[model samples]
Target chain A: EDFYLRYYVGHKGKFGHEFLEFEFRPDGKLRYANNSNTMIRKEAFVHQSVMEELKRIIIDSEIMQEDDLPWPPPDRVGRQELEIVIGDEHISFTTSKTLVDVNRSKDPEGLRCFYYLVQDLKCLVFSLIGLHFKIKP
Target chain B: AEEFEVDEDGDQGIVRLKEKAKHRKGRGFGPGPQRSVEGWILFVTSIHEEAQEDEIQEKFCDYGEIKNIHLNLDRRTGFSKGYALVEYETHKQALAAKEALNGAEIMGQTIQVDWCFVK
Candidate 1:
């Protein structure tokens, strides 16, 4: 069984917009590309332990409940989107911006999974691209 | 902790220099986010020097209704600056053009396509 997860986050602006996409496969391989197109891309291999942590969060996160899931999160324009697929199960969510590293008190619903998800994905990208989130989590 | 040496020649533009240093002392502020009046347009770059407005419109018109094409001109030469803003009649058409034309070559140059979502 193969698993696939892809996420995109970017905004348009005067200096030319920036778009980034990242996908992970069952083989522990993670690949990413920007609006630069298919020819320019990068990939990496996640350690098995960290990969398992990703899976655990995907499973435990309340955002994954299909019925409760909203295709695109409400109340924001030019929001970010996330997609997760494993075996036959598929889920996707979008938000204006994934709140990253928030105090649990500020968010009682424990919806900060997106925050952690974004944080880790950013960590992954930081290692691959050596970029320090000028565009952010 | 701040000290300034006034020029022996009196002001000599030193006050302006000090004001500038004060303004740029730390993490500097940038121009900030820019907004575009036309969000339904795509900014196409890497245009070949020989490329013309008609050719772009001809190739991209099928993707969507042509609104207007604003091609940049060389400041001195009046030649194409190799970029243009293509406005479309519909959002769908703009996206269609972006996906199809991006990375596609015209006049021996690969084009970069993206929508203008500013403002």
Candidate 2:
């Protein structure tokens, strides 16, 4: 049977903060992948041809956009710490980061959120539009 | 010396590169004991202390066709042993993967790759 994996980026209760989804065929091939954020909200789900395409939009329109609606949101208020949706699984990224913080501050959580967001964005683009690459076993 | 030369030639087929063995070690250090007749399984070991699941999947995907890749992180400590299990399509693909990514450096440390089949 075909499997669909969705990976998201966010903190605790925040939904739609940042999300990526991948569809894997029964044959273990990647069928589709996508991410959702401020710059690109639930539009028509345009699938690009290269991860660079999505990344370009993210950097230019989201991160470096300098607009009222930033991809990550300039303000930290009500921001999700981290969230990951792999296949049928959904995981929280903040809980893990919290344990690693020696200072016990929110920085680790912030950093983890930031890094995963980037990764989620990249993977979504690659799985959806980039070259049909697979992991070697 | 003639016998030695003959033995060496015969051993050539069996003579594997030490580097290759080291590479295998680097690649074999991940998740394990998974079923593989239907797909390939990739083993990743000693991932960076701070490695994440996304990073592991992304980096390993660069090596070959990854059927499924999972990093085994310590639930209690939240620290990763720097190991993961990656399942692929076929044994050939797994071997190809080992050759491609064994001993390759990721996030500073060299990663090990290997093929794993469930018993």
Candidate 3:
């Protein structure tokens, strides 16, 4: 019962600060928060099947092996953080897409997989929020 | 990898350029199986060790959707370790299963069931 994931990305330079964040709690609750005109924030319990799907993605993507990769290279900068808690181990790191050029072989396969994981999680969270609201009325 | 130091801060000593491209140590290890949602799992013991998955599911599926079932197997023996962790979506369903399935029988063995993780 020791799986947790939290991801956040934001840009706050010269003017405004805005970000989108989500967390998959160990108890199967999904928490999403964003700052904008509406300031949306919500939490809901996810189904077991959904968790299973998530596990599949985690295993298939193989991002777990990318934990030690250097990110947000000093030359390239941005604000983003990803953290995963599994069993007794924990890892948190900041990354930027521009830092690693995926088009070149210099980019590690695991790093590209990390972004793929994030995008998939983003879509999954959106679908989950939709399902949570659809059954209300 | 190029290493450069900018020395025009005009205050403190300029920090030396740190080396980059240090290969990560201990690579290639992947994570274990996904874990259950806290509080939604049941710790079951006294299993037949040779019990089939459906055998356990058939006995417990009545309570709710069996999201995941893990019957730990001994690496050396390749047989069950006499226990399993059954996951449910909701606490209500898990509790129902725990109360109903505790002391239940499967494959002529009396199994014990309880909360895998409790508050």
Candidate 4:
């Protein structure tokens, strides 16, 4: 099933760290905003290959089947806030912990794949908008 | 809509969300706290590269105490992107300025101004 997924990455506290949102639509369009200073309205298209990778990761993770959601406190107070949405389903979780430990041992790569995909999406988005996203070689 | 009020330090920004804006439910996408703004933001475009922050602040300060200002300057070249964000502590001051000065000039250069609606 095709859908849109939006992710929030950064701390969630009263005077928290930089919080940013990225919206990945089914059409390969990406809209990102930096809430730290709130630079609104920067949009780009995810290169088709990367978009396919994101789709694979999400589907394989099977986040919907997993539980202990609404997700933290084992997660610290102000570490990570993740929200995913598609159709009538909307799930939000606050996880202030490590990556591998959070997901399953059998499917050890699930959360890591998801997290890496999010970071990789940022690199892709930044490159599109002409920002110096990666380190100098 | 509820008006925005800030402490003496002027920390609260364009976010003193409307009552209806707050009652989010399922099928809703709520933004993060940094964007958890309540009230006023004026988008100033076509701003001259030569505009000074002090001058802009001095010109708009007549309306009320402003909360913040975001001026986009080129990171590589130091020139402006011809846009700026002027924020006020209350909707009262922001709307007033947006109405009165939308097509007005700051340094003999006409600029476009519009109220920013949080989504």
Best by TM-score: 3
lDDT of 2 by residue, A1-137 (tens): 21112233333235544433342212222323233332221111221112222233233222221211112332233332222222232222222221244235434444444454445444333422321233210
- How do the predictions measure up, each by TM-score? 0.37, 0.32, 0.48, 0.37
Q: Please give the TM-score of chain B in predicted model 1.
A: 0.65
Every model's DockQ, to 2 decimals? Answer: 0.01, 0.02, 0.03, 0.02
The deviation in Å at residue A116 for candidate 4 is 25
Span of 10 residues, lowest total lDDT, candidate 1 chain B: B25-34
- Per-model C-alpha lDDT, please? 0.53, 0.40, 0.58, 0.50
Instruction: Please give the range of 10 consecutive residues that has the lowest summed lDDT in model 2 chain B.
Output: B22-31
Off by over 4 Å in 3: A74-77, A97-100, A134-137, B1-119
Chain B TM-score of predicted candidate 4 relative to the true chain B: 0.64
**How would you encode candidate 4's per-residue C-alpha lDDT over A43-134 as one tens digit per residue?**
54443333444454455445644433333333333345445544444445444433546465434454554455455445434433333121
lDDT, candidate 1, at A9:
75
lDDT of 3 at B106: 92
Candidate numbers, best TM-score first, in rank order: 3, 1, 4, 2
Residue B91 of model 3: what lDDT? Answer: 78
Shift of residue B98 alpha carbon in model 3, Å: 21
Please give the distance, in angstroms, between residue A109's alpha carbon in candidate 1 and its true position after superposition.
1.8
The model with the greater lDDT, 1 or 3, is 3
Candidate 1, DockQ to 2 decimals? 0.01
